[PDB]
Design a protein around this ligand. Structure first.
Ligand SMILES: OC[C@H]1O[C@H](O[C@H]2[C@H](O)[C@@H](O)[C@@H](O)O[C@@H]2CO)[C@H](O)[C@@H](O)[C@@H]1O
Ligand code: CA
Lengths: 16, 441
């Protein structure tokens, strides 16, 4: 869930 | 590119465009210049989109509140009527189309919303908003309703929002204070709360648009509507027996509709400016030209003195709007607030709090302070907070900028020893994208 929260953060930072 | 040697005119489809086209046909017969009148939906937003490319109509017709933004974008030609022509129109109409010293449009008509009512259903119209819920109750027992009007456009609800104290921008020190917005004060809250309550109690439907309201009034289903003089022509046809009167009071205070001056601007990229001036001054702004338009759809009150003297006898026949560039932010703020409050998506409080922010959207603060020891000559990117919450300082154009990674991001630890990277472009805009690849989890 946190490691998933991290993988989901990556995708965000990658766009922004 | 705009075609030389003809005139293309844009006017909203609710106005007397067929009457305008007849003035155009006379201009054609006398000059051999084709005049084409067009009426695209949402023209007020389409005009700046098309015109900034050097395309669009020769002449654009809208209420004056949009024209300051157009002029600041360089989209409008300065107009050049002689003092004698200027004298034929009311002073205050010229004031409405003056922006930063210059006349930017010709005033045509003065537009104000009124209460339109069905005399057969309602021989005496209510003097107060407060009596409308009871009236609706009586009318519902007969399978009718008291009131339907366009809830989708804030122009129609503003009169009630403004009645007890709402305002757009405050006139301070001889100018509109763009920081002093009044969409979220007690009076605005009270007006909008009333509207939401009308809806909560099923006296009105949140989804009512222009067409539901017009059809409802004209089929004899609702006793009242709110609209401008352009709408009268459609009622005339319907043979509902209608009256027109002042909007009712709220908490004992008159309704306060924002008044528009329908105005005609000349596209700065037109190669037909002298033709457009001739058409406007010598054909449209005459008794005969305005009569041609008025006969199609009523103009209400007009800028031209000689013709207004005839019209003022009509029994059927409130503040002038600013023309400032911030008016479109204001209208967008109120539109959003009204739709959100009416549909229950937000409370009145929430909606109008967001409206205050959006109306003053040109104005965050903390980021600007955190690098005010800079003195840069030439192009610069201003202090800006990115979508992640990272503060980018005021930087020279043409430079890569380096800021540490956020300590927390969505409640997540990051090492602030790592950096993110953003280019301040050669033109002084920030690159749209930030490189955050290095901020490891
Ligand atoms: O509703 C926001 C809208 O209000 C005014 O637009 C009026 C226009 O003045 C009238 O000529 C008529 O056509 O109806 C419009 C509303 O449907 C403002 O002029 C406009 O800028 C604003 O967006
Ligand atoms: Ca429309």
């Amino acid at each position: 869930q946190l490691a998933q929260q991290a993988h989901s953060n990556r995708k965000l930072m990658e766009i922004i | 590119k705009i075609e030389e040697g003809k005139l293309v005119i844009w006017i909203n489809g609710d106005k007397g465009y067929n009457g305008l086209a007849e003035v155009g046909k006379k201009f054609e017969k006398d000059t051999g210049i084709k005049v084409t009148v067009e009426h695209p939906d949402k023209l007020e937003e389409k005009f700046p989109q098309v015109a900034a490319t050097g395309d669009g109509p020769d002449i654009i017709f809208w209420a004056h509140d949009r024209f300051g933004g157009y002029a600041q974008s360089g989209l409008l030609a300065e107009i050049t009527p002689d003092k004698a022509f200027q004298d034929k129109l009311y002073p205050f109409t010229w004031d409405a189309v003056r922006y930063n010293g210059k006349l930017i449009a010709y005033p045509i008509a003065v537009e104000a919303l009124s209460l339109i009512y069905n005399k057969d259903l309602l021989p005496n119209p209510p003097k107060t908003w407060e009596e409308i819920p009871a009236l609706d109750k009586e009318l519902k027992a007969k399978g009718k309703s008291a009131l339907m009007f366009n809830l989708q456009e804030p122009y129609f609800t503003w009169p009630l929002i403004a009645a007890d104290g709402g305002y757009a921008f405050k006139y301070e020190n001889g100018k509109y204070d763009i920081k002093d917005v009044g969409v979220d004060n007690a009076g605005a809250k009270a007006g909008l709360t009333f509207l939401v309550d009308l809806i909560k109690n099923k006296h009105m439907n949140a989804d009512t648009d222009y067409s539901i309201a017009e059809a409802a009034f004209n089929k004899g289903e609702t006793a009242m509507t709110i609209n401008g003089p352009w709408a009268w022509s459609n009622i005339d046809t319907s043979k509902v027996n209608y009256g027109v009167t002042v909007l009712p009071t709220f908490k004992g205070q008159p309704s306060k509709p924002f008044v528009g001056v329908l105005s005609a601007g000349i596209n700065a990229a037109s190669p037909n400016k002298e033709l457009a001036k001739e058409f406007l001054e010598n054909y449209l702004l005459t008794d005969e030209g305005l009569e041609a338009v008025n006969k199609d759809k009523p103009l209400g009150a007009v800028a031209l003195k000689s013709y207004e003297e005839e019209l003022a006898k009509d029994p059927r026949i409130g503040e002038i709007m600013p023309n400032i560039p911030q008016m479109s932010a204001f209208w967008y703020a109120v539109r959003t607030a009204v739709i959100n409050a009416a549909s229950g998506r937000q409370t009145v409080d929430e909606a109008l709090k967001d409206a205050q922010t959006n109306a003053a959207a040109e104005f965050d603060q903390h980021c600007e302070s955190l690098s005010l020891a800079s003195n840069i000559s030439g192009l610069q990117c201003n202090a800006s907070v990115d979508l992640i919450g990272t503060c980018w300082p005021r930087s020279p154009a043409g430079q890569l900028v380096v800021r540490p990674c956020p300590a927390f991001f969505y409640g997540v630890r990051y090492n602030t020893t790592n950096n993110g990277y953003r280019e301040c472009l050669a033109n002084g805009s920030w690159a749209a994208r930030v490189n955050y690849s290095e901020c490891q989890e």
